[PDB]
Amino acid sequence: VLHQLRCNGVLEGIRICRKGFPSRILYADFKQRYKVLNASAIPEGQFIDSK
Amino acid sequence: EFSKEQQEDFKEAFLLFDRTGECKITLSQVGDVLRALGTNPTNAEVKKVLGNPSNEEMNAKKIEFEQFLPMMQAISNNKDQGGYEDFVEGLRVFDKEGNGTVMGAELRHVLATLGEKMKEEEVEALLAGQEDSNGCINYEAFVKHIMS
């Protein structure tokens, strides 16, 4: 599997997307899954828009 | 520094806990002296800078009133204790279906199996009977009852 991943360019595609920004998360998902982190930063229920 | 009013309130709580008449509170009780003054200290807060011994362990040390006064000021009165906003989004980790409802078994399991673990005796004592059919427990109602 390692030899095949080297020869077929899958290992190149992972080093390519690490040059860029590979992980792409919606504003809603980022707020809804991860609110637990930062209660001090993320205030009241007036904080809609989600941006 | 504390007010004269705060010193007298802290003293009024103290004069109950030294119940043998010694002018001295047993060290085990100090976390529950803090709870008696309306602060909510963790057992991790209690064993560090408040200087408490083991849990439920008596005799090892005693504390004079003047010694207790920085042990209110520099401890739970020098930190965050959590608010409503904490509890609502901590409970929403266990809100599977988004309705403000958590199973009573799951809520008892979070209290007994996670964190600074609660006795089942404690869990029943804090339970206001708010369990329906399989409509289960409204967790916001639970937080508002426990913070009143």
Tab-separated table of C-alpha atoms in Angstrom:
chain	number	residue	atom	x	y	z
A	1	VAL	CA	0.000	0.000	0.000
A	2	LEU	CA	2.865	2.475	0.705
A	3	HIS	CA	4.602	1.604	-2.620
A	4	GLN	CA	1.314	1.998	-4.526
A	5	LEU	CA	0.558	5.345	-2.745
A	6	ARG	CA	4.047	6.650	-3.712
A	7	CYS	CA	3.736	5.536	-7.357
A	8	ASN	CA	0.113	6.626	-7.978
A	9	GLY	CA	0.567	10.238	-6.740
A	10	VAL	CA	-1.702	10.099	-3.641
A	11	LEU	CA	1.294	11.051	-1.461
A	12	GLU	CA	1.945	13.996	-3.800
A	13	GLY	CA	-1.706	15.182	-3.472
A	14	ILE	CA	-1.434	15.289	0.342
A	15	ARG	CA	1.842	17.333	0.218
A	16	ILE	CA	0.176	19.654	-2.364
A	17	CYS	CA	-2.899	20.441	-0.214
A	18	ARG	CA	-0.634	21.147	2.792
A	19	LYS	CA	0.879	24.042	0.758
A	20	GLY	CA	-2.664	25.516	0.634
A	21	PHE	CA	-5.443	25.350	3.211
A	22	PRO	CA	-6.910	21.808	2.993
A	23	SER	CA	-9.548	21.836	5.750
A	24	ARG	CA	-12.676	23.797	4.874
A	25	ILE	CA	-15.427	24.156	7.517
A	26	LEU	CA	-18.773	26.051	7.340
A	27	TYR	CA	-19.400	29.022	9.716
A	28	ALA	CA	-22.470	27.199	11.127
A	29	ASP	CA	-20.585	23.874	11.676
A	30	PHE	CA	-17.597	25.657	13.255
A	31	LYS	CA	-19.890	27.441	15.731
A	32	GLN	CA	-22.206	24.453	16.405
A	33	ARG	CA	-19.561	21.726	16.960
A	34	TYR	CA	-16.875	23.842	18.727
A	35	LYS	CA	-18.706	26.407	21.038
A	36	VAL	CA	-17.438	24.432	24.104
A	37	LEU	CA	-13.880	25.826	23.551
A	38	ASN	CA	-14.327	29.525	24.197
A	39	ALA	CA	-17.325	30.617	26.336
A	40	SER	CA	-15.319	33.790	27.210
A	41	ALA	CA	-15.100	34.799	23.519
A	42	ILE	CA	-18.506	33.614	22.219
A	43	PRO	CA	-21.167	35.682	24.050
A	44	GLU	CA	-25.005	35.775	24.244
A	45	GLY	CA	-27.804	34.523	21.941
A	46	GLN	CA	-27.773	37.886	20.120
A	47	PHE	CA	-24.521	36.642	18.484
A	48	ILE	CA	-26.247	35.322	15.316
A	49	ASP	CA	-24.945	35.729	11.665
A	50	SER	CA	-22.303	33.080	12.673
A	51	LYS	CA	-19.471	34.874	10.799
B	1	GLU	CA	-8.971	43.228	51.262
B	2	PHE	CA	-12.410	42.289	52.670
B	3	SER	CA	-15.140	44.643	53.993
B	4	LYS	CA	-16.127	44.655	57.720
B	5	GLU	CA	-19.510	43.336	56.533
B	6	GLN	CA	-17.787	40.495	54.572
B	7	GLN	CA	-15.594	39.702	57.620
B	8	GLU	CA	-18.675	39.457	59.870
B	9	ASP	CA	-20.586	37.278	57.286
B	10	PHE	CA	-17.523	34.957	56.993
B	11	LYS	CA	-17.386	34.900	60.837
B	12	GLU	CA	-21.139	34.091	61.167
B	13	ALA	CA	-20.559	31.052	58.943
B	14	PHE	CA	-17.344	30.183	60.897
B	15	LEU	CA	-19.033	30.291	64.381
B	16	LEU	CA	-21.349	27.462	63.335
B	17	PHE	CA	-18.612	25.159	61.991
B	18	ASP	CA	-16.351	25.285	65.111
B	19	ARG	CA	-19.339	23.627	66.957
B	20	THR	CA	-17.096	22.004	69.668
B	21	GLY	CA	-16.450	25.593	70.940
B	22	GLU	CA	-12.749	25.715	70.079
B	23	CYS	CA	-12.691	28.908	67.899
B	24	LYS	CA	-11.301	26.570	65.209
B	25	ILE	CA	-12.813	24.827	62.179
B	26	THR	CA	-11.584	21.318	61.255
B	27	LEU	CA	-9.736	21.520	57.918
B	28	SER	CA	-12.050	19.062	56.056
B	29	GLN	CA	-15.027	21.406	56.472
B	30	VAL	CA	-13.355	24.458	54.784
B	31	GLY	CA	-14.676	23.650	51.254
B	32	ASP	CA	-18.191	23.432	52.702
B	33	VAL	CA	-17.632	26.675	54.686
B	34	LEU	CA	-16.932	28.203	51.218
B	35	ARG	CA	-20.131	26.526	49.865
B	36	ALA	CA	-21.936	27.918	52.949
B	37	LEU	CA	-20.834	31.432	51.798
B	38	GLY	CA	-22.304	30.844	48.284
B	39	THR	CA	-19.069	30.169	46.374
B	40	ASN	CA	-18.912	26.923	44.377
B	41	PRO	CA	-15.384	25.504	44.748
B	42	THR	CA	-14.184	22.384	42.908
B	43	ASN	CA	-12.409	19.686	44.960
B	44	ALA	CA	-9.334	20.509	42.819
B	45	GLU	CA	-9.667	24.176	44.013
B	46	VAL	CA	-10.250	22.936	47.593
B	47	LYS	CA	-7.119	20.702	47.823
B	48	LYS	CA	-4.674	23.245	46.317
B	49	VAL	CA	-4.598	26.866	47.532
B	50	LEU	CA	-7.344	26.300	50.152
B	51	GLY	CA	-5.106	23.625	51.767
B	52	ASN	CA	-7.779	20.904	52.493
B	53	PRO	CA	-6.598	17.300	53.390
B	54	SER	CA	-8.100	14.128	51.837
B	55	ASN	CA	-11.829	13.854	51.037
B	56	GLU	CA	-13.993	13.129	54.128
B	57	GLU	CA	-10.773	13.045	56.302
B	58	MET	CA	-10.927	14.714	59.758
B	59	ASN	CA	-8.398	15.580	62.526
B	60	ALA	CA	-5.293	16.333	60.380
B	61	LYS	CA	-5.372	20.155	60.707
B	62	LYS	CA	-7.626	22.911	62.127
B	63	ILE	CA	-8.021	26.554	61.022
B	64	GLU	CA	-8.422	29.739	63.134
B	65	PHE	CA	-10.869	32.508	61.953
B	66	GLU	CA	-8.137	34.981	60.836
B	67	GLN	CA	-6.505	32.116	58.861
B	68	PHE	CA	-9.875	31.480	57.109
B	69	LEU	CA	-10.129	35.143	55.868
B	70	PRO	CA	-7.379	34.965	53.074
B	71	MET	CA	-8.732	31.418	52.369
B	72	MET	CA	-11.979	33.035	51.254
B	73	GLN	CA	-10.342	36.064	49.492
B	74	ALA	CA	-7.497	34.513	47.458
B	75	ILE	CA	-9.267	31.271	46.449
B	76	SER	CA	-12.804	31.109	44.903
B	77	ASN	CA	-13.088	34.921	45.096
B	78	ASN	CA	-9.932	35.195	42.913
B	79	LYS	CA	-11.196	32.997	40.027
B	80	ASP	CA	-13.855	32.144	37.497
B	81	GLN	CA	-16.501	29.733	38.911
B	82	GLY	CA	-18.584	29.254	35.690
B	83	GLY	CA	-21.902	30.762	34.585
B	84	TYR	CA	-25.090	29.708	32.782
B	85	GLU	CA	-23.315	29.975	29.393
B	86	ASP	CA	-20.757	27.275	30.412
B	87	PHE	CA	-23.390	24.738	31.514
B	88	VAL	CA	-25.723	25.197	28.531
B	89	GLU	CA	-22.989	24.473	25.933
B	90	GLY	CA	-21.418	21.690	28.091
B	91	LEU	CA	-24.849	19.994	28.249
B	92	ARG	CA	-25.311	20.501	24.459
B	93	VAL	CA	-22.488	17.955	23.923
B	94	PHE	CA	-25.005	15.366	25.243
B	95	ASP	CA	-28.012	16.916	23.419
B	96	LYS	CA	-28.260	14.315	20.647
B	97	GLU	CA	-31.508	15.575	19.076
B	98	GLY	CA	-31.406	19.339	19.797
B	99	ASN	CA	-34.527	19.693	21.947
B	100	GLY	CA	-33.072	20.674	25.368
B	101	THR	CA	-33.805	17.109	26.541
B	102	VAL	CA	-31.241	14.602	27.857
B	103	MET	CA	-31.960	11.081	29.191
B	104	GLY	CA	-32.014	10.878	33.040
B	105	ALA	CA	-29.633	7.904	32.879
B	106	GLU	CA	-27.186	9.888	30.666
B	107	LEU	CA	-27.355	12.942	32.989
B	108	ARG	CA	-26.767	10.733	36.098
B	109	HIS	CA	-23.886	9.052	34.175
B	110	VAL	CA	-22.245	12.464	33.428
B	111	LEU	CA	-22.468	13.392	37.147
B	112	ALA	CA	-21.322	9.965	38.485
B	113	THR	CA	-18.807	8.765	35.823
B	114	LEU	CA	-17.152	12.034	34.675
B	115	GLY	CA	-15.245	14.874	36.448
B	116	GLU	CA	-15.130	15.124	40.262
B	117	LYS	CA	-17.596	12.191	40.484
B	118	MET	CA	-20.892	12.454	42.386
B	119	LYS	CA	-22.285	9.855	44.792
B	120	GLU	CA	-25.715	8.398	43.726
B	121	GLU	CA	-26.908	9.737	47.110
B	122	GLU	CA	-25.874	13.267	45.984
B	123	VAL	CA	-27.503	12.747	42.525
B	124	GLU	CA	-30.902	11.710	43.984
B	125	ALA	CA	-30.755	14.577	46.552
B	126	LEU	CA	-30.366	17.180	43.741
B	127	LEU	CA	-33.082	15.634	41.510
B	128	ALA	CA	-36.331	17.670	41.297
B	129	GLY	CA	-38.344	14.767	39.714
B	130	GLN	CA	-38.346	16.278	36.211
B	131	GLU	CA	-38.497	13.000	34.210
B	132	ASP	CA	-41.253	12.249	31.652
B	133	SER	CA	-42.359	9.016	29.808
B	134	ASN	CA	-39.438	9.051	27.447
B	135	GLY	CA	-39.600	12.872	27.231
B	136	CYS	CA	-36.775	12.691	29.821
B	137	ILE	CA	-35.044	15.667	31.561
B	138	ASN	CA	-35.115	19.310	30.435
B	139	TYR	CA	-31.455	20.207	31.169
B	140	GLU	CA	-32.005	24.023	31.176
B	141	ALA	CA	-34.615	23.627	33.957
B	142	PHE	CA	-32.070	21.487	35.861
B	143	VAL	CA	-29.353	24.226	35.554
B	144	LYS	CA	-31.752	26.995	36.657
B	145	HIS	CA	-32.852	24.953	39.728
B	146	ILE	CA	-29.204	24.178	40.708
B	147	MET	CA	-28.166	27.866	40.279
B	148	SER	CA	-30.998	29.225	42.485
